[PDB]
Design a protein around this ligand. Sequence first.
Ligand SMILES: [Ca+2]
Ligand SMILES: [Ca+2]
Ligand SMILES: [Ca+2]
Ligand SMILES: [Ca+2]
Length: 313
Amino acid sequence: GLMDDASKAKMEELERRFKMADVDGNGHIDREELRNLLESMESGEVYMMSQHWLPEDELERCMEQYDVNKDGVISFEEFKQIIYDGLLLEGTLAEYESAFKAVDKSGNGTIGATELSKLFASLGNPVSLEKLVDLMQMYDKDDSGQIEFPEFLLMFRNSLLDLKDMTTYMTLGSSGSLVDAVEGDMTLIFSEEELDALISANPDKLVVVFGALTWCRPCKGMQRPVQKLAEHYKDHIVFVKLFGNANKQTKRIFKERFQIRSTPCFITLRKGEPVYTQTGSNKEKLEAGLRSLIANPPVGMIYPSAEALAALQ
Ligand SMILES: [Ca+2]
Ligand SMILES: [Ca+2]
Ligand SMILES: [Ca+2]
Ligand SMILES: [Ca+2]
């Protein structure tokens, strides 16, 4: 009775919303009613009932937090906290589909790390490759090496992205590829399918795989060197970076395909086959080794060593 009118209206609306989510009308929100409430669009007003898209982890994640008394069900008071914390998708299915298509510059229907990097950089918040690893670990939950639509949705649920970033990005032909390398720059990959695509796309260049780990310090020291070699040697060599520990696929590439035992590791592929392997932080040795594979290398070295310089002849 003694609530103010504005508060009474807010509460009446939360009550209306709660009753809507409580589909069976039984007075509360169980785990399976909450699954659909989390799968919904337009602030709980449109349920996508074709089939489920939310991973089970996510629902359990949600009950863990908002079920405070631990009776396996969501009460009205607990439901308010879900609303306040912004868990429901506010946009329409079409707005999320438009945003996904905008980010998927290749137009193949999935978002790769290279695409994510461009989105962040284009919006003035360029991210490091190590941070792209973190984004993929947090959102590529099926270890596909791509962000599919349902995973993109969780970027909005968690406020990593906002539908205004998207409108801005839209303001700023397509290949159809899984990955499109940027000439002169290393490509960070998250799947074997991307590795193979890059090899197939570069039949007449050497492909150098830079294997790193996210906590490896000497690896970090080689990142700037490799960026300079990727520019200098672009007519001859494409570089492809993978962090072995990123996901199930990268672990397998490290252990089964290349048998990488120490990092940083540089594996040079000719027509997809390892022909030259070097490990560690010796830049002079790495570059001399790469150069020895090239008929007509660029003039000048980035990391000369006395030995690597031709005598006056
Ligand atoms: Ca119910
Ligand atoms: Ca509860
Ligand atoms: Ca794409
Ligand atoms: Ca995925």
